[PDB]
Assembly symmetry: C2
């Protein structure tokens, strides 16, 4: 699958801004982004359930616009297509293969193959009325798998991320991937779901693509403020800073606290200009226990959460509007109202310009 300047608009309203994507075979892709960003319309377009106003959709290697959705090789899981009561799980899954003209031979052979990957063999000849919710969901997936598609497409489960039925879905999805290894495209609004299942993630915002990449790439190198705060929770901290110097690929900024300390960041530096007002980002997990000298931020403890596996502190630093959120492992016994100090590692900091674009990190990391 490959997208080329694909756009979707009604009259003059643009819901999908010329999207460019390149999905390599076998990849598990997930479209993520806030409500109404256009993740589902984009999916439906690939499926053929919505028209593409301009642009090219390549599936396999050949243009698929103009081609009937059935002959594209794509398969969408129709989450709301009610099972045909008074029909066996097998009859339901094979139903579609009937009007098409398939032979009992292929039918009762492709039905036994999907019946294995989805664990339904022992439920095949059963009435829907006797199936649980968790297994009715699987019959739907099996329904789209017997048509033997080359691109599996699934949209957001109308469930609710902790809703048992959606946890099932999530496990089945990954199981199915590590089994057939076929190309898949999933849609969700939940950042965690994305970081968990994806091979490649495409963050969407206001109909445009904010960024595309591996989970770890989005994590360590967000291209802008939006992505920086969309992946990871609790959310990245943002502190206001001013540029005071510039070397080759470095950039020295000044911290807001009194005594305005200066720190160098291994950042892009391309075009910055001394005196500019920028935004410095540092994730709560990456702050340090302050035992380590260098740059130290200090305030008064506003909140303390003991979660067992870790501890989250909310500190209020004098000369910063929003509370700084700290995160460490195990205990760390502190009382509200007490003064707490934490370290600021320049190698783990991010720098964002006025447009919110990130002045690239030059550090190195695991993926």
């Amino acid at each position: 699958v490959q997208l080329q300047n694909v756009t979707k608009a009604w009259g003059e309203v643009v819901v999908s801004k010329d999207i460019n994507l390149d999905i390599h075979e076998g990849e598990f892709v997930v479209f993520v982004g806030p409500s109404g960003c256009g993740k589902s319309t984009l999916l439906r377009m690939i499926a053929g359930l919505e028209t593409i106003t301009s642009g090219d959709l390549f599936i396999g290697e050949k243009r698929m616009n103009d081609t009937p959705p059935a002959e594209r090789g794509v398969g969408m899981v129709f989450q709301s297509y009610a099972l045909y009561p008074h029909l066996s799980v097998a009859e339901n899954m094979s139903f579609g293969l009937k009007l098409a003209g398939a032979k009992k031979e292929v039918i009762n052979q492709r039905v036994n193959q999907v019946a294995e990957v989805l664990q339904l063999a022992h439920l095949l000849d059963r009435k829907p009325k006797a199936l649980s919710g968790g297994q009715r969901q699987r019959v739907a997936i099996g329904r789209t798998l017997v048509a033997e598609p080359s691109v599996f497409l699934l949209d957001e489960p109308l469930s609710n991320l902790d809703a048992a039925l959606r946890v099932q879905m999530r496990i089945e999805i990954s199981r199915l991937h590590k089994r057939l290894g076929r190309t898949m495209i999933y849609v969700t609004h939940d950042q965690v779901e994305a970081m968990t299942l994806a091979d490649k993630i495409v963050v969407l915002d206001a109909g445009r693509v904010a960024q595309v990449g591996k989970p770890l790439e989005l994590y360590h190198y967000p291209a802008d403020r939006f992505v920086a705060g969309f992946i990871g929770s609790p959310k990245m901290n943002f502190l206001p800073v001013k540029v005071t110097a510039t070397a080759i690929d470095q950039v020295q900024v000044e911290l807001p606290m009194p005594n305005r300390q200066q720190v160098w960041l291994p950042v892009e530096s391309r075009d910055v200009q001394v005196g500019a007002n920028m935004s410095l980002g540092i994730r709560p997990e990456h702050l340090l226990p302050s035992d380590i000298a260098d740059v130290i931020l200090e305030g008064e403890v506003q909140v303390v959460e003991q979660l067992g596996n870790e501890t989250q502190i909310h500190i209020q630093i004098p000369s910063i509007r929003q509370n700084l959120v700290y995160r460490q492992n195990d205990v760390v016994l502190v009382e509200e109202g007490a003064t707490f100090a934490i370290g600021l590692p320049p190698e783990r900091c991010h720098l964002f310009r006025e447009d919110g674009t990130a002045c690239r990190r030059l550090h190195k990391e695991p993926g």
Copy 2:
């Protein structure tokens, strides 16, 4: 607030099994448990919206059964009491203080006080039709706050948990606590919410009280298997073991893997009996990088999750049915199918008997 053998039954069906609780003044208590455990019925009983079949309910220090719900000093928040359209936020909040016979003096004085803590002073004389969902929720709270209760009672928000409206609620709840310091009782089915807001937590199961205590107490010392796997996620690992010895407050168990290694655990030991079949629990966060000798568990990597802040590995050990789940910080680069080894620390292990009761833990954890 104090409960004493409080029971609730319909004919012979028992929905609340003699409950004992002792809520100290100012405490923020939260009732947690799975769907249908009886957490809401219990709250409604304290409120006076449901009768107590037997037992004693003390509020303040005096028996409150038999006393009209309005004169108990308790204030419930009615999430379904639709605002009176064609009435200002002040008229809605004071409404109930009208039929009661209040004077405009107290009315327009208690309405300005609650208007502050809830940030509504600037919206007082406004029509509901012009208020947003987030602020309508607050009017409801302000509604129950002007009656100036001594025990605040809030039930489960019909939202979800990621639902923006519920995140607001949660923030308001804690803000309100760190402000008036009054006794509060909240109900939820989400373990995380509980560990985050509570001063004290009471886990409920099938109408009984599984356990009561501070969040850290439930986490380090579950009283039984149920609690052990209800708090914390991903869930605690459970491995089958056999008792091979017994010293004074130390039991030696045998691990299921080949070469059946024996390990001593600083556990209760009261009544165990050599040869018994028991359950050993170890949380994912507490397993170790294996670099440390002692007990070593080894298998093949089935799943790897890169979440940025941490990494979750799913290993399959030969001679255990369920995948062992590991958890570590930062990266840990491993590929599926590869073999991985982790350490098992005796000091962080839990031991459960056949009844699921936690017979154990002498090891002191700072909290």
